[PDB]
Paper text:
[name] belongs to a large family of Type IV P-type ATPases (P4 ATPases). These enzymes translocate specific phospholipids from the extracellular side of the plasma membrane or from the lumenal side of internal organelles to the cytosolic side, creating and maintaining lipid compositional asymmetry in eukaryotic cell membranes. [name]-[name] is activated by the binding of phosphatidylinositol 4-phosphate (PI4P), the Arf guanine nucleotide exchange factor Gea2p, and the Arf-related small-GTP-binding protein Arl1p to the C-terminal region of Drs2p9,10.
After 2D and 3D classifications, some 640,000 particles were selected for 3D reconstruction and refinement, leading to a 3D map in the apo form at 2.8 Å resolution. We found the purified [name]-[name] was free of any ligand in an autoinhibited apo state. In our apo [name] structure, the ordered region of the [name] C-tail is 57 residues long and fills an extended horizontal groove between the second-tier A and P domains and the third-tier N domain. The C-tail appears to cement the A, N, and P domains, preventing ATP binding by inserting these two phenylalanine residues into the nucleotide pocket and physically separating the N domain from the P domain, so that Asp-560 of the P domain cannot be phosphorylated. This structural feature readily explains why [name] in the apo form is fully inhibited by its C-tail. In particular, this N-peptide engages in two hydrophobic interactions with the A domain, one involving Ile-203 of the N-peptide and Leu-427 and His-422 of A domain, and the other involving Tyr-198 of the N-peptide and Val-304 of A domain. These interactions likely account for the observed inhibitory effect of the N-terminus on [name] activity. We suggest the apo [name] is in a unique autoinhibited conformation that is distinct from any of the four active states of the SERCA ATPase.
Numbering used by the authors:
A (entry chain E): 21 to 359
B (entry chain A): 196 to 583, 597 to 1241, 1253 to 1309
């Protein structure tokens, strides 16, 4: 029969067609530049507000000082404080048969940084975003379930089983983890602060709900082969790790996206860090030669972006530059074209 | 015993041909083979970077939705096949004797049916009985063949005595019939009655597609039925017709598969270089497998899965929904609706809709498609007077007024004999209706136009008696009684007919009508008195496309008709050759005539046909006419519908057995060796081929030779073409020098011609109906092809062009970050986003913006797209959709994915881009950041490539952004707890709780939208050459082409046409009928009055 004469069916819909006059496009470009300039200023200023300190301590054992406080070379130190650092950071390498080449790092904070300070370890050239790497953890097994043989996740394949036993934290991530134990104290030298730090509230809040203490009895399981030095005899009911409590395991299990990443260890969100000289004692357990890059620790005090990253700050100014560079091209062209 | 039913199933699939024809129809496109195989090899263990069942899932959704559109399409044509199949049919029953109103489906072979008049015939039937003397009946085969005349279908003498419905119980026997082959004019059979053998012929062979006219009823023994019939045999399958836009889509899938294998080679060779160079620095992977070619193959498959989504999965489905929904919105238009017979312009295949913007050649039928099959008495050149604006009826009041000037008027016996000639010299049959009107049963619509035009001018024709009186009725007088003495039948080698009469005062006179080239060689007219003015009025008739006859008379004495009637009596009783000896007699009698005058009737075209053909030739489309009717008829129709203009040369080609290369070589040697400007030489040159001259000229020694230099004509009018050679013309043009073709026809002489085309249009409405149901688009009337083609194809091609190129853009704008991350993962094959979120990209959140680009936008209004038919040539050249512009869109996706990638690299550096208590944005928070940023660049680009904004574009362009921003905490907050996407634990808190996630979504799309916003400003404020350049856009060769054999000028055309066949009935009909005596006791029984 006859089709309806509605505006929908007869293709007479109420359509708005925007004409791109320079009375509309050009105030749009001047407005977008005019709104992305002050925000981008506010995002470089809030990214140059944070005050980090990165010390590449990867070549602390092969460079060994081991007797005095000698300077760190300028390839390794990166500081971005508000004040200038008068005394350069020092480094040494103690060895007392139980410390096993701990690297005392002795830096000089030049101002009392009042925002919450966060200590990371930066690892360069560790491909934690590898395809075989972001798999290789049994999700039911980090939940605490006694997952037996042939029920384990097959993505754990090289680090899945051992001498007629199974590895409880199987796979590549739960092997191969960064084990340079940072000291819980920024030890202030010459009686400055003796500043404390916590390895609690370090991971995500949902990792602390998923990573649970396991239900094995330590005779069905075996530790993964890379951290077999902390467990030389193996797994016993006394020394068995609480995955729910350890919380530096599960910042490593939260694999980052890039070869060059931070991972959180320490923080203190309740007090300011004064302008003392601080000795941070790092027990060097994790070799360079495992991966192929630099291990460094970062002492940072993040902001609204969350770090000294001027990228999105200058990236509002590339867009706010082009909306003003072409808002003058398409206005001087707009005047001189009918001239 | 296993004969067919009577259903014409034009379904694309029936029951078991669904799955091979649909899976072959889906896997003929390369972007479903590619995901069948990247679905299959994704099942290889430890290879899939996404999931086992991602591409399985979304390929399955694509397959189900495309099967849903295929299913609804085939149901919407299945109830139309059933609509044709529930038509009425009266069938004799063995239990009780009456014919009962059954359907067409319930007809089998050997079933005596009864069909009424001016209503169609369901099957190929032998006429056993009829209501007419000696059981004859008429039929109009304007859908079998194309001729507009009517055909004698005589029934046999031994079987025509079964007039009664009650008495055909003892009619027992068999019919040893012909094989069901498709020779239309040929039938062989031997019916066996109760005692005797009866020889059969195509005389008693009413076929399916034609209608019974000018009778009361027939009795038909059904022989062939359904697809067993002669006309629908090799003509109904609904084939898969690959549109020309999806072919160049397929070469764009070859193009993206080329850049795919470039990325998998760059990527996997990078995996070899990094996996063997830094093997001491990748010891935290445990790559102890030293098979480097094996892991080259496995990792080759990982990048073959992770890059596999560069070709879009929702490509052919969203194009099927744009094509289906455009086909819905053009099958529901008031401007394409024909309100006289209530046909709402339905589009059936729904996937050949962007073909309508591609059409270069249209291959039309003449009969029914261009004409209304009505002939009206237009004008009459009568004693050398037509008129002195156009007035014609004022001559008719000057004719009834000039006749009553009988004391002082020289023309009054001449116009008296002309008006007597209009209503006496014919073979029409008068039918006394119940009302106050008379209906003329005419085997020629020419003769019906002449008799009805004489009846509208005084002399109303009243009663025929067989070898007896022939009476009329004057308006001034009462009744005059004539006496038809002899009749001279019309013949194509004769081109005239005559009828010797006896006036009621005793004066034996001859009347004769025909062509001036045949009549005018045989007359005197007292030293060409009325002759030259008759000539110039014939030229005035043929210049307007009017069918024309020269109507003359002479006188016969009593002894001349005595001896001549004797000679014609021994000439009529000869069984050697009756037609040839009656022609030799019937031009021994036709000497020294007197040219009384001329007539002019028109074949009464469909509404808007010259305006449509004119506005299609302005669109760059070359309309050819593939007709089954005569040459002179189609030259007069092409003259009337403004195909043949004034001063057009008509390259006639009427070949013989091997006299082909004389006509072709003479016209092409005399055509190519001299060269004019050749733009205004196109417009004064046309081709007219026969059907015997085209079965000999469609063969590969003459085939490309015909087309590639005889496409230099403006109009090609292929005259008297069978339903086979029409399809041979269409296949011949779409194969050699492959353009995009359109076919339009009314009846089932065109059903092979419509299915063999790129898009086949059909005419719905009247008795020509079978072509419309087995069409791609069924249209009420030919004039709707102007708005259906120029508006609804230029929209349907440009919108589908921007939709396809946009979907290639959007898929290479998401999934190319996957390749830039190969440089940063380890050349390893790490997916950035979660598995199902990518499936959600190409299934839920970017699938509607191509749908609203492809439908609810317009780039040209419907006003200026039909006020300027020159804008249709933008689509024929393939300007909007090519592979070069495709590389513009793909490289645009590379640039946008590159700046989304690099931007989010520098923004989320180290993962350290959160304020939430020192926590770090991981792999997957960054993954939905580049996913969401790519969503906003992609629908931001869809905002930049829509011209107009409807309320459905505001649902799809920003409402897909809003639908993802609402969708993502629901999905990532519910489905991790159902162990489906366990990569999303905490990702809502670490993305939507992030300041620098929403900051990234604000600015990082506005970089890409700065590029396309400034370029989209520039290409419509300073680069306007898409529409506006098109809006702002000799005698020696003609003397050479006039010298060629069979070339006919326009100024010498006299417009003769007379639709009457040799088996149409002239001399048998007049000797049988009575109008005075009424019907018999059984039907409208007329006795054999002989
Ligand atoms: C800290 O981690 C490193 C490497 O991640 C451990 O070094 C490995 O120790 C095992 C067992 O002693 C050896 O078989 C490997 O060859 C060592 N890999 C190296 C040196 O690259 C180290 O033992 C860990 N220290 C602990 C747990 O205190
Ligand atoms: C604070 O620092 C001192 C100095 O090392 C340490 O002994 C003490 O346990 C710390 N307090 C804590 C960790 O609560
Ligand atoms: C932060 O450091 C101060 C010393 O400056 C210490 O007293 C306090 O306990 C520390 N807080 C935490 C949570 O470690």
């Amino acid at each position: 029969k006859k089709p309806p004469n509605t505006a929908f069916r007869q293709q007479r819909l109420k359509a708005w067609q925007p004409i791109l006059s320079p009375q509309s496009v050009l105030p749009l470009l001047i407005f977008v530049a005019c709104i992305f300039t002050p925000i981008g200023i506010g995002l470089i200023v809030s990214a140059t507000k944070v005050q980090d300190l990165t010390i590449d301590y990867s070549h602390c054992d092969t460079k060994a000082s081991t007797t005095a406080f000698e300077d760190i070379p300028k390839k390794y130190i990166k500081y971005h404080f508000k004040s200038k650092v008068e005394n350069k950071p020092q480094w040494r390498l103690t060895e007392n048969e139980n410390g096993e080449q701990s690297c005392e790092l002795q830096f000089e904070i030049p101002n009392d940084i009042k925002k919450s300070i966060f200590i990371y370890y930066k690892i360069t050239n560790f491909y934690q975003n590898h395809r075989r790497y972001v798999q290789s953890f049994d999700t039911k097994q980090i939940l605490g379930e006694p997952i037996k043989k042939d029920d384990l996740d097959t993505s754990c394949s090289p680090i899945r089983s051992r001498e007629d036993k199974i590895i409880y934290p199987c796979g590549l991530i739960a092997n191969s983890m960064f084990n340079d134990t940072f000291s819980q104290v920024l030890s202030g030298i010459d009686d400055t602060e003796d500043y404390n730090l916590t390895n609690k509230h370090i991971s995500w809040s949902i990792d602390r709900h998923r990573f649970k203490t396991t239900k094995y009895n330590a005779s069905d399981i075996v530790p993964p082969p890379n951290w077999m030095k902390k467990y030389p005899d193996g797994y016993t009911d006394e020394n068995l790790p609480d995955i729910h409590t350890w919380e530096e395991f599960q910042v490593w299990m939260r694999t980052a996206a890039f070869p060059k990443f931070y991972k959180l260890t320490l923080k203190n969100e309740s007090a300011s860090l004064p302008k003392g000289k601080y000795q941070m004692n790092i027990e060097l357990n994790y070799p360079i030669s495992l991966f192929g890059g630099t291990k460094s620790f970062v002492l940072t005090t993040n902001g609204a972006i969350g770090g000294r990253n001027m990228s999105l700050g200058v990236l509002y100014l590339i867009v706010a530059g082009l909306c003003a560079l072409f808002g003058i091209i398409f206005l001087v062209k707009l005047i001189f074209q009918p001239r | 015993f296993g004969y067919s039913d009577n259903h014409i199933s034009t379904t694309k699939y029936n029951f078991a041909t669904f799955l091979p024809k649909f899976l072959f129809q889906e896997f003929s496109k390369y972007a479903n083979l590619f995901f069948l195989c990247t679905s299959a090899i994704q099942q290889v263990p430890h290879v899939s970077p996404t999931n086992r069942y991602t591409t399985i899932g979304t390929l399955l959704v694509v397959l189900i939705v495309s099967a849903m559109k295929e299913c609804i399409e085939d149901i919407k044509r299945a109830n139309s096949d059933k609509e044709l199949n529930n038509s009425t049919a009266e069938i004799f029953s063995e239990a009780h004797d009456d014919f009962v109103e059954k359907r067409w489906i319930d007809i089998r072979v050997g079933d005596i049916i009864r069909v009424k008049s001016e209503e169609p015939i369901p099957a190929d039937t032998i006429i056993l009985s009829s209501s007419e003397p000696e059981g004859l009946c008429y039929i109009e085969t304007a859908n079998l063949d194309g001729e507009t005349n009517l055909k004698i279908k005589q029934s046999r003498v031994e079987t025509a005595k079964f007039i009664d419905v009650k008495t055909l119980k003892n009619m027992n026997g068999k019919v040893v019939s012909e094989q069901p082959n498709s020779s239309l004019y040929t039938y062989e059979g031997t019916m066996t009655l109760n005692d005797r053998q009866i020889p059969l012929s195509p005389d008693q062979m009413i076929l399916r597609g034609a209608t019974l006219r000018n009778t009361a009823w027939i009795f038909g023994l059904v022989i062939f039925t359904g697809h067993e019939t002669k006309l629908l045999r090799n003509a109904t399958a609904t084939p898969i017709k690959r549109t020309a836009v999806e072919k160049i889509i397929n070469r764009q899938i070859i193009a993206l598969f080329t850049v795919l294998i470039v990325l998998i080679l760059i990527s996997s060779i990078g995996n070899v270089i990094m996996s063997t160079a830094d093997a001491k620095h990748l010891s935290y992977l445990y790559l102890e497998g030293t098979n480097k070619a094996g892991l080259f193959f496995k990792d080759f498959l990982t990048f073959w899965i992770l890059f596999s989504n560069l070709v879009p999965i929702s490509l052919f489905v969203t194009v099927e929904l744009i094509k289906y929904y455009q086909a819905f919105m053009i099958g529901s238009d008031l401007d394409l609706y024909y309100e006289k017979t209530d046909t709402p312009t339905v589009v059936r295949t729904s996937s050949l809709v962007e073909e309508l913007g591609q059409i270069e050649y249209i291959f039309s039928d003449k009969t029914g498609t261009l004409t209304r099959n009505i002939m009206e008495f237009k004008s009459c050149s009568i004693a050398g007077h037509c008129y002195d604006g156009i007035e014609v009826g004022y001559r008719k009041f000057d004719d009834l007024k000039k006749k009553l000037n009988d004391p002082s008027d020289e023309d009054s016996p001449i116009i008296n004999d002309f008006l007597t000639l209009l209503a006496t010299c014919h073979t029409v049959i008068p039918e006394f209706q119940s009302d106050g009107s008379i209906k003329y049963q005419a085997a020629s619509p020419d003769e019906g136009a002449l008799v009805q035009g004489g009846a509208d001018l005084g002399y109303k024709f009243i009663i025929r008696k067989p070898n007896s009186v022939t009476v009329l009725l004057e308006e001034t007088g009462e009744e005059k009684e004539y006496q038809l003495l002899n009749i001279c039948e019309f013949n194509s080698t004769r081109k005239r007919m005559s009828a010797i009469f006896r006036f009621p005062d005793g004066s034996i006179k001859l009347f004769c009508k025909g062509a001036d080239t045949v009549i005018l060689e045989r007359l005197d007219d007292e030293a060409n008195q009325y002759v030259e003015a008759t000539m110039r009025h014939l030229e005035d008739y043929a210049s307007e496309g009017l069918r024309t006859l020269c109507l003359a008379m002479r006188d016969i004495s009593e002894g001349e008709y005595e001896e001549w009637n004797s000679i014609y009596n021994e000439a009529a009783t000869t069984l050697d050759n009756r037609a040839e000896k009656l022609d030799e007699a019937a031009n021994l009698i036709e000497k020294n005539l007197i040219l009384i005058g001329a007539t002019a009737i028109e074949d009464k075209l469909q509404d808007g046909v010259p305006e449509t053909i004119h506005t299609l030739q302005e669109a760059g489309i070359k309309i050819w006419v593939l007709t089954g009717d005569r040459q002179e008829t189609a030259i007069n129709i092409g003259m009337s519908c403004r195909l043949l203009s004034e001063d057009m040369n008509l390259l006639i080609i009427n070949e013989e057995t091997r006299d082909d290369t004389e006509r072709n070589l003479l016209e092409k040697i005399n055509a190519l060796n001299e060269h004019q400007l050749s733009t205004h030489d196109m417009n004064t040159l046309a081709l007219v081929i026969d059907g015997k001259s085209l079965g000999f000229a469609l063969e590969p020694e003459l085939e490309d030779y015909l087309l590639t230099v005889a496409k230099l004509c403006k109009a090609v009018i292929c005259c008297r073409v069978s339903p086979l050679q029409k399809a041979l013309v269409v296949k011949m043009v779409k194969r050699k020098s492959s353009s995009l073709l359109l076919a339009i026809g009314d009846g089932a002489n065109d059903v092979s011609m419509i299915q063999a085309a790129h898009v086949g249009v059909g005419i719905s409405g009247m008795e020509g109906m079978q072509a419309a149901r087995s069409a791609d688009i069924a249209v009420g009337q030919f004039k709707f092809l102007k708005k259906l083609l120029l508006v609804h194809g230029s929209w349907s091609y440009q919108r589908i062009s921007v939709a396809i190129l946009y979907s290639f853009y959007k898929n290479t704008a998401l999934y190319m970050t996957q390749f830039w991350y190969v440089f940063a993962n380890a050349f390893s094959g790490q997916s950035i986003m979660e598995s199902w979120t990518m499936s959600f990209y190409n299934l839920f959140f970017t699938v509607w913006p191509p749908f609203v680009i492809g439908v609810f936008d317009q780039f040209v209004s419907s006003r200026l797209l039909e006020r300027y038919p020159q804008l249709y040539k933008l689509g024929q050249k393939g300007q909007f959709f090519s592979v070069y512009i495709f590389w513009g869109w793909i490289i645009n996706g590379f640039f946008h994915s590159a700046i989304v990638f690099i931007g989010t690299i520098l923004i989320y550096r180290y993962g350290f881009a959160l304020n939430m208590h020192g926590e770090l944005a991981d792999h997957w928070s960054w993954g939905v950041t580049v996913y969401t940023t790519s969503v906003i660049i992609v629908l931001g680009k869809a905002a930049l490539v829509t011209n107009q904004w409807t309320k459905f574009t505001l649902i799809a362009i920003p409402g897909s952004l809003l639908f993802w921003l609402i969708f993502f905490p629901i999905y990532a907050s519910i489905f991790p707890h159902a162990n489906i996407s366990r990569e999303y634990y905490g990702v809502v808190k670490h993305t939507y709780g992030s300041g620098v996630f929403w900051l990234t979504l604000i600015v990082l799309p506005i970089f890409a939208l700065v590029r396309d916003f400034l370029w989209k400003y520039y290409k419509r404020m300073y680069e306007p050459e898409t529409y506006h350049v098109i809006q702002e856009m000799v005698q020696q060769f003609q003397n050479a082409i006039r010298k060629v054999r069979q070339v006919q000028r326009m100024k010498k055309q006299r417009g003769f046409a007379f639709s009457q066949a040799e088996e149409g009935g002239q001399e048998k009909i007049v000797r049988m009928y009575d109008t005075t005596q009424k019907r018999g006791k059984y039907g409208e029984l007329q006795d054999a009055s002989a």
